[PDB]
Amino acid sequence: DEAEASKFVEEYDRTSQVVWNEYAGANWNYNTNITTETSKILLQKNMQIAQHTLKYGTQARKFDVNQLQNTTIKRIIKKVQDLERAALPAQELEEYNKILLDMETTYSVATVCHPQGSCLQLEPDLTNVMATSRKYEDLLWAWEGWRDKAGRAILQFYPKYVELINQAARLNGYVDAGDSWRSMYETPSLEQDLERLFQELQPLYLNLHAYVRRALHRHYGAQHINLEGPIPAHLLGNMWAQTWSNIYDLVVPFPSAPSMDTTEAMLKQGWTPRRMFKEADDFFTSLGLLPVPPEFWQKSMLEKPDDGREVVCHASAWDFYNGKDFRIKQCTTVNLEDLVVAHHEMGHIQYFMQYKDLPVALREGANPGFHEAIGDVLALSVSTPKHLHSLNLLSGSDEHDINFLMKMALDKIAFIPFSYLVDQWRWRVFDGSITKENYNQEWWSLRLKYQGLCPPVPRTQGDFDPGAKFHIPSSVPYIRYFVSFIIQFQFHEALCQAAGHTGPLHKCDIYQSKEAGQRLATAMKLGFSRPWPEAMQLITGQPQMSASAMLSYFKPLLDWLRTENELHGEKLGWP
Numbered sequence: 241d242e243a244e245a246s247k248f249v250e251e252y253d254r255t256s257q258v259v260w261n262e263y264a265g266a267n268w269n270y271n272t273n274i275t276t277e278t279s280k281i282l283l284q285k286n287m288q289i290a291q292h293t294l295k296y297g298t299q300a301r302k303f304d305v306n307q308l309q310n311t312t313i314k315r316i317i318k319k320v321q322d323l324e325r326a327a328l329p330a331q332e333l334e335e336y337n338k339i340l341l342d343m344e345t346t347y348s349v350a351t352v353c354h355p356q357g358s359c360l361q362l363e364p365d366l367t368n369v370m371a372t373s374r375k376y377e378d379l380l381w382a383w384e385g386w387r388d389k390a391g392r393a394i395l396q397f398y399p400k401y402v403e404l405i406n407q408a409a410r411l412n413g414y415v416d417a418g419d420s421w422r423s424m425y426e427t428p429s430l431e432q433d434l435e436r437l438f439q440e441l442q443p444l445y446l447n448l449h450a451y452v453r454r455a456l457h458r459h460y461g462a463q464h465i466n467l468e469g470p471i472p473a474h475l476l477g478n479m480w481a482q483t484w485s486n487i488y489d490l491v492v493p494f495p496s497a498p499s500m501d502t503t504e505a506m507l508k509q510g511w512t513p514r515r516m517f518k519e520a521d522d523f524f525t526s527l528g529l530l531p532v533p534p535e536f537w538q539k540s541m542l543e544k545p546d547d548g549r550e551v552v553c554h555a556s557a558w559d560f561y562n563g564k565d566f567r568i569k570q571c572t573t574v575n576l577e578d579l580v581v582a583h584h585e586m587g588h589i590q591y592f593m594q595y596k597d598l599p600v601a602l603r604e605g606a607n608p609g610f611h612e613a614i615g616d617v618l619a620l621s622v623s624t625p626k627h628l629h630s631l632n633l634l635s636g637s638d639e640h641d642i643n644f645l646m647k648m649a650l651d652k653i654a655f656i657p658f659s660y661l662v663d664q665w666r667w668r669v670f671d672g673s674i675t676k677e678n679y680n681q682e683w684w685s686l687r688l689k690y691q692g693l694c695p696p697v698p699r700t701q702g703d704f705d706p707g708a709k710f711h712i713p714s715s716v717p718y719i720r721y722f723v724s725f726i727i728q729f730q731f732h733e734a735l736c737q738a739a740g741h742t743g744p745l746h747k748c749d750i751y752q753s754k755e756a757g758q759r760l761a762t763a764m765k766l767g768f769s770r771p772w773p774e775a776m777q778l779i780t781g782q783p784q785m786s787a788s789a790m791l792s793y794f795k796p797l798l799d800w801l802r803t804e805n806e807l808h809g810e811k812l813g814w815p
């Protein structure tokens with residue numbers, strides 16, 4: 241009966257708001273204030289939101305969704321029938337919740353210490369080492385140290401996490417957790433679709449990789465860089481080698497065309513974390529999109545507390561499920577990398593605000609990729625030399641242009657293989673083809689195969705390098721970032737065309753375009769109410785994911801890399 245189904249969705253929606261709001265409160269409090277106490281209230285509210293999920297979920301499963309005519313209702317009920325962890329028996333649920341908490345806590349409080357010297361946390365200290373040291377041995381100390389302290393300490397938890405997450409997936413009708421994660425795209429051809437996108441980025445990626453390898457060879461010496469082999473994973477300016485723009489100084493295409501020290505510019509001009517968020521807010525409002533509410537400025541944690549409070553530093557954006565309270569929790573350092581991060585997070589806030597009037601079951605991105613893409617799209621415009629000039633962080637030439645595209649490539653292109661491999665690994669862990677006997681080995685096998693990277697120190701038994709990357713102990717799916725990086729360029733392209741830009745796509749800055757804002761807004765308003773091809777069609781006027789926009793953006797760089805690599809005789813790739 242349609243009327244009983246409609247009443248159920250109404251009752252689900254009012255009751256979810258309340259319970260989700262409380263849960264979000266306690267999680268927030270833990271995340272911003274890791275103590276025995278907040279941890280206990282968190283584990284408590286876990287049981288509460290599960291009891292709600294189990295009640296409504298058991299109700300939802302009694303409806304034959306086949307017989308439902310209204311498609312919105314049908315879709316809400318189908319999703320409520322998935323209980324996630326709340327399908328587990330009470331004992332296993334308690335253990336699962338404890339395992340997650342323990343993994344996240346371990347990661348978030350790990351330090352790496354010099355004997356008789358000072359301890360370094362990941363943010364800011366170890367991050368700053370990976371970004372600015374140009375000494376092999378110091379990079380190595382930070383890279384190995386982090387894996388020794390974060391990664392190896394996660395290993396004790398991960399087999400049990402895999403068992404429980406998979407058990408929950410099976411109890412919701414999936415074959416394993418990885419199947420459940422992939423189902424969020426509602427795209428049976430996902431794996432194939434992503435593989436093809438990955439393959440189209442290989443020319444750019446291999447040419448980038450070879451040119452960076454050459455430059456590393458020049459700086460670190462021939463005894464440390466094989467010009468036909470993988471790059472050591474500690475030399476790319478980032479703990480995970482997932483983005484390479486911190487080694488821009490080593491790889492500048494045109495060192496004659498100098499570029500401002502944007503960090504020193506930000507610092508010298510008294511930028512603060514608050515200023516960084518306010519500029520993102522200005523950009524969203526310039527498009528005719530929504531401002532963040534006053535409450536956001538009062539409640540968000542935009543820098544690392546100095547008061548001895550221990551926190552989850554890893555930046556994140558929060559929906560409190562009442563349509564009024566949205567926040568960001570970021571340990572913001574004043575630099576360009578973090579400004580892009582602030583935009584990314586403000587993009588999530590903007591989405592929470594555009595879909596806040598949907599039923600809570602439909603308050604998500606069209607697919608998780610879309611959620612990740614919004615803030616990045618704006619940041620692409622922010623990053624342009626012309627925009628950075630207007631912010632007084634930079635001072636025509638082909639030389640400055642190739643330099644710019646290189647800077648962008650070191651972020652965008654370098655991330656393509658990393659973002660692809662993380663869930664290639666986890667999918668295989670979840671489906672049981674990687675056991676705990678070879679977690680680490682299979683990880684490095686994909687690091688090699690996709691990114692062309694090798695470990696600077698041979699791994700041993702007891703290593704679990706995956707555990708040294710946040711998303712792994714925190715159980716946050718990763719393929720969304722791969723989708724994001726592809727579709728963000730398609731969105732930029734479409735927004736630029738809508739805004740009347742002509743000329744090379746990389747020169748576009750959509751600041752203040754209402755036409756561009758209006759496309760984003762009508763897509764974000766759909767939330768999860770329709771298949772994601774419809775939101776794609778709304779923004780871009782076609783319904784597929786496609787690498788052609790990102791290739792078009794980087795085409796002048798591709799031509800330059802090819803000429804450069806050919807001139808030097810590079811052999812692209814590695815064995």
Ligand SMILES: *[C@@H]1O[C@H](CO[C@@H]2O[C@@H](C)[C@@H](O)[C@@H](O)[C@@H]2O)[C@@H](O[C@@H]2O[C@H](CO)[C@@H](O[C@@H]3O[C@H](CO)[C@@H](O)[C@H](O)[C@@H]3O)[C@H](O)[C@H]2NC(C)=O)[C@H](O)[C@H]1NC(C)=O
Nearest residue numbers: 245246247248249250309310311312313597598599602769
């Ligand atoms: C299938 O059912 C959906 C959902 O219906 C809504 O949710 C149910 C659980 C019940 O509570 C329904 O009584 C309830 O309306 C229908 O979608 C809804 O359609 C209405 C009217 O077309 C939309 O209303 C708009 O509301 C805005 C304010 O937000 C007004 O300013 C607009 O002028 C406009 O009238 C409403 O957004 C929409 N709801 C959702 C969540 O999508 C749908 O129409 C129906 N399909 C069929 C076959 O009729």
Ligand SMILES: CCC[C@H](N[C@@H](C)C(=O)N1[C@H](C(=O)O)C[C@@H]2CCCC[C@@H]21)C(=O)O
Nearest residue numbers: 482554555556557580581584585612716721
């Ligand atoms: C709970 C998820 C937090 C996550 N935190 C950010 C900082 C994050 O982990 N990442 C990913 C990462 O840092 O591994 C890459 C992604 C794209 C560029 C901006 C930062 C984004 C996010 O907001 O998606």
Ligand SMILES: *[C@@H]1O[C@H](CO)[C@@H](O)[C@H](O)[C@H]1NC(C)=O
Nearest residue numbers: 273274275276277278547549
């Ligand atoms: C941190 O948590 C403790 C223990 O729950 C609490 O008593 C204290 O007031 C909190 N500090 C902040 C900054 O909220």
Ligand SMILES: [Cl-]
Nearest residue numbers: 473480705706
């Ligand atoms: Cl690693």
Ligand SMILES: [Cl-]
Nearest residue numbers: 608717719720
């Ligand atoms: Cl995802």
Ligand SMILES: [Zn+2]
Nearest residue numbers: 584588611612
């Ligand atoms: Zn994100």
